[PDB]
Structures are given as C-alpha cells and as structure tokens.
Specification:
By secondary structure, the protein is α+β, with helices and mostly antiparallel strands. It contains 9 helices and 11 strands. It binds the ligand Nc1ncnc2sc(-c3c(-c4ccccc4)ncn3CC3CCCCC3)nc12. Belongs to the protein kinase superfamily. Tyr protein kinase family. Tie subfamily.
Length: about 290
C-alpha cells in the first residue's frame, strides 16, 4: 500500500551507516519523487498514518529478488539536531554571524515551528495510542520545506509498554519512571519532548552538559531539572518544566503543548533569542556524552 515497481527506482547515493539505506527516485501515481529506500531481509497499512504532514510518509514497498525494499518520504536536510547545529553561525560562518547580528541562520519563529511540528505529530500519534519512546532532536527529520517530520517505525501501541534494557540508553532523554522501571507511556514521551524542546532552544546543545549518566540517576529523583538557557524566554522554559514534572499524569498532553506553542507563535514577541546584542553563549555540544 501502495506497491512499487522495481523499474521505477533509480538509486542515487547511500545515506548513513548501519541498517542499509539509499536515496532513490521513484515513480508513484505517475509522479517522480525522492524516496529513501531500505532493504529488509525476508504493520505497513498502519504506516499511513504517514498521511500526516509531520510523520515521515510511506511511499511504496516492493519485493525484488527475494527482498522487500521499503520506500518512504525523503528528508532533504538530515536529522533535526545536526540541522540545528549547522545553524550555529558564530562557529560555522562568523563573518556572516557578525554582519547579521545573529547566532543562528534559524529564527525564533522557525525554531518554534519545529517544536510545533513535532508537538503536532506526537499529538496525532499519542491519540492513536502510540508510544514513541525515542523522542530526541537527532530522531526527528527535517523534511521538504523545512517541515519537521517524525519516524513512525517500531512504535509500541498501547496504554503502557515495558521494555527490558541491554545497546545504549538515551538516558538524558528518559523520564524517571522510565529510568527506574523501563516503562514508557505517552506521559514518558512528553518528558522526552521537553528535552527535545530544550534541545531546539539551545540550537543543539547536549542536555546535562558535564554531568555523567550516573550523576543524573541520583539527581533527578532529587528534583533536579535542566537549566533554563540564556537565550530562552521564561514561558518556553516553563513549558519544558511541565513536561518534566515528577508525577507523570501531572504532565501536559501534546494538544496542551501544541496549543501553547501556537499562542507563542502568533505573538510578535521573540521567545527564543538568536540575536547577538552584547553577549551570546552556545550551549556546549562536546562534553563527555
Ligand atoms: N526518510 C529519510 N530521508 C532521509 N534520510 C533518512 S535516514 C532514514 C532511516 C531509515 C529508513 C527506514 C526505512 C526506509 C528508509 C530509511 N532507518 C533509519 N533511518 C535513520 C534515522 C534518522 C533519524 C530519524 C529516524 C531515522 N530515513 C530517511
């Protein structure tokens, strides 16, 4: 749904590392478009769903010499985290940075729309009972027209899902119940989303720069939260803080989040500063992460 003919695929380049994925061009319903194709060895109807503008759409699937190749909507601009980081103009093009009084090629409004974008997608998923379990900047793709898209693959669907650990955990993104007990819910997804939001605001900062994974475990039950960024308005931070409430059911819903962003967007006020003025400080990326 649909079905792709092999003879319409023209592969262009490989993308990433390892599973095994490629950039193609497919023909679908008489139109030519970029796809990303992954080839699996040896669930798809629910994969649309993708019909939503912030969810990587499924384009086609196609059996060829014993394999199933899966074509999905192609994202021109990488994961959101890199995109954001490459936007750090003081570091990548300071002549530009100074001339234009700016710390990013991205604007506060644009930064928020990525937030809204993901917020919106999640809202639509969470209300169809899906649990992402991996919300993080690096896990969001920036798609055509710079519209942020979520990945719908391997999504647990249900009220709650327990997964046993053992690979690496996104500790810095996880909420406490997930930390304590390896359980994920939609409410666990919102916690992660606030870290995503925090990530966006820090133009790609590593959350909890300096702290180690051990330190976090001990300090989070303690009531410790990520520090409000120097470029961030108080309400934006406030919103992050709600996502990180200790009591899961206390946190907001994506609708609530989304409502609140949409308000912020409609105001003329800058909620996320990217303008140099007299001082500006990029959240650390390095650290021992
Ligand atoms: N649509 C795309 N356009 C650009 N590049 C890529 S890389 C990619 C991908 C796939 C994949 C899965 C199915 C088909 C094709 C690719 N499996 C892991 N990834 C990498 C992950 C990156 C972070 C967010 C989750 C996906 N999909 C895209």
């Amino acid at each position: 749904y649909p079905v792709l003919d092999w003879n319409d695929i023209k592969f262009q380049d490989v993308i990433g590392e390892g599973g095994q994925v490629l950039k193609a061009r497919i023909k679908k319903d008489g139109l030519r478009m970029d796809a990303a194709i992954k080839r699996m060895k040896e669930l798809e109807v629910l994969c649309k769903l993708g019909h939503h503008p912030n969810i990587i759409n499924l384009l086609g699937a196609c059996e060829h010499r014993g394999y199933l190749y899966l074509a999905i909507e192609y994202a021109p601009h990488g994961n959101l985290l890199d995109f954001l980081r490459k936007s750090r103009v003081l570091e990548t093009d300071p002549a530009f940075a100074i001339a234009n009084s700016t710390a990013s090629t991205l604007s506060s409004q644009q930064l928020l729309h990525f937030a809204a974008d993901v917020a919106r997608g999640m809202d639509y998923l969470s209300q169809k009972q899906f649990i992402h379990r991996n919300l993080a900047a690096r896990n969001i793709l920036v798609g055509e027209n710079y519209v942020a898209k979520i990945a719908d693959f391997g999504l647990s669907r249900g009220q709650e899902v327990y997964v046993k650990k053992t690979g690496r955990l996104p500790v810095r993104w996880m909420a406490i119940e997930s930390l304590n007990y390896s359980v994920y819910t939609t409410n666990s997804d919102v916690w992660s989303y606030g870290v995503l939001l925090w990530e966006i605001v820090s133009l790609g900062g590593t959350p909890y720069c300096g702290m180690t994974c051990a330190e976090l475990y001990e300090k989070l039950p303690q009531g410790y939260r990520l520090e409000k960024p120097l470029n961030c308005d108080d309400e934006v931070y406030d919103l992050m803080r709600q996502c990180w409430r200790e009591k899961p059911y206390e946190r907001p819903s994506f609708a609530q989040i989304l409502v609140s962003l949409n308000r912020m967007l409609e105001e003329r006020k800058t909620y996320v500063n990217t303008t140099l003025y007299e001082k500006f400080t990029y959240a650390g990326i390095d650290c021992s992460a």
